[PDB]
Copies of this chain bind each other. A is one copy, B any other.
Amino acid sequence: NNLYRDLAPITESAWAEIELEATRTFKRHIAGRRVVDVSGPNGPTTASVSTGHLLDVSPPGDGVIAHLRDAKPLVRLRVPFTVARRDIDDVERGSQDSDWDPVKDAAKKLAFVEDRAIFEGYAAASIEGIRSSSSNPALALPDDAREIPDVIAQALSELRLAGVDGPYSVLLSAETYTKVSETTAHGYPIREHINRLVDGEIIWAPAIDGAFVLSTRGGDFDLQLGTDVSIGYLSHDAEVVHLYMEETMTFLCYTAEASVALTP
């Protein structure tokens, strides 16, 4: 295939180690996939997602009405990294302390870009994020950690006024999650205080900035994937090999009233 892995100077065991390390880190650092419906890979031939809408266009001639079908293009994200042939070779010698830090960093970068496109928007890819697409009024996250549950209750009140149902979930930023975790009250963390309110789960969202309270009934958010995360090979040298992590995706929000955003 287009990955050209058979041409890389890497053994099966080292390939397995790299894949495992990247998968673990990405699954750690990814959050949107846990609260958004995912349309499984449709193949490399997939390039756009139809919206079912029509756009006006100049007719070819008299007596003819012309309309253009509307589609959302898919964007390919590629993050390159470099690995050492010595660490690669040591694996077949029964070594199991090899350095895969570039792999972990690339996985973190890819997860962050994906989550930031989902929750904030990537305009050049025509991706409007949940924050912008949300219709319910946005709130402000208090500087202190003790007042956050009140704001979350207000956001639940807003959604739950608007008429959305299903389990509710709170996605918190790295800085906010650290705050609610370190901070404590009556012998419990402010994070447990927050958890007490919702029916769903509390989720880490390091890539995003602020906080988000959203419904998970289904049918409101769609992450379309052409091809899932993959690892490939570009070139190599006497000392290093250059690889990349690739994924082709787009994001769509259909219900603007199923989420509430809180800004720092």
Residues of A within 8 A of B (CB): 1-2, 4, 6-7, 9, 11, 24-25, 28-29, 44-48, 50-54, 57-58, 60-61, 63-71, 73-80, 89-97, 104, 108-110, 112-113, 116-117, 122, 124-125, 149-150, 153-154, 156-157, 161, 163, 165, 174, 178, 181-182, 184-189, 192-193, 196-197, 219, 226, 234-235, 238, 244, 248, 252, 254-255
* Interface residue from B68, B96, B153 paired with A181 (Cβ < 8 Å): B153
Asked whether A163 lies within 8 Å of B108 as measured between CB atoms, the reply is yes
Asked whether B53 lies within 8 Å of A125 as measured between CB atoms, the reply is no
Q: Which residues of B contact A104 (CB under 8 A)?
A: 163
Asked whether B67 lies within 8 Å of A76 as measured between CB atoms, the reply is yes
Q: Given contact pairs A46-B50, A48-B71, A52-B94, enumerate 15 new A-B contacts (beta carbons under 8 Å).
A: A1-B92, A52-B95, A53-B95, A61-B112, A63-B79, A64-B109, A65-B80, A67-B75, A67-B76, A67-B78, A69-B74, A108-B163, A153-B181, A187-B196, A234-B238
Asked whether B79 lies within 8 Å of A69 as measured between CB atoms, the reply is no
* Interface residue from B66, B78, B90 paired with A125 (Cβ < 8 Å): B66
In the complex, A44 Cα to B60 Cα: how many Å? Answer: 22
Asked whether A2 lies within 8 Å of B69 as measured between CB atoms, the reply is no
In the complex, A104 Cα to B95 Cα: how many Å? Answer: 33
Q: How near does chain B come to A71, taking the closest CB pair, in angstroms?
A: 4
Q: Which residues of B contact A122 (CB under 8 A)?
A: 60
**Would you mind naming 21 contact pairs between A and B with Cβ atoms under 8 Å apart?**
A7-B9, A24-B165, A25-B163, A28-B163, A47-B48, A51-B95, A52-B94, A53-B95, A60-B77, A60-B116, A63-B80, A68-B76, A68-B124, A68-B125, A69-B76, A97-B255, A150-B182, A153-B182, A153-B189, A154-B182, A234-B238
